[PDB]
Amino acid sequence: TFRMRIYERDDFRGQMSEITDDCPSLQDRFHLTEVHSLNVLEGSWVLYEMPSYRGRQYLLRPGEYRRYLDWGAMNAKVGSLRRVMDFY
Structure with missing residues (x-):
């Protein structure tokens, strides 16, 4: 299953x-x-960063990310997201 929770603040x-x-x-x-x-x-x-899997990307492994700095971004702008299909 893949599952993540996103928050406004x-x-x-x-x-x-x-x-x-x-x-x-x-x-x-x-x-x-x-x-x-x-x-x-x-x-x-x-x-x-952008819709349809365009723009800069940031990889997220299981865990807690309290600010956008935690996933290495410069700002909190996100246009799309998807599941990683890498098995390893």
């Missing part, structure tokens, strides 16, 4: 949305343009 504050499937446009599905903290519960995921 840093440090797991604000409204939380749970995702278990690929998301080519976070704006369309969640009316969201930024993610300020997230918890990856199962599976690995890639965050992308």
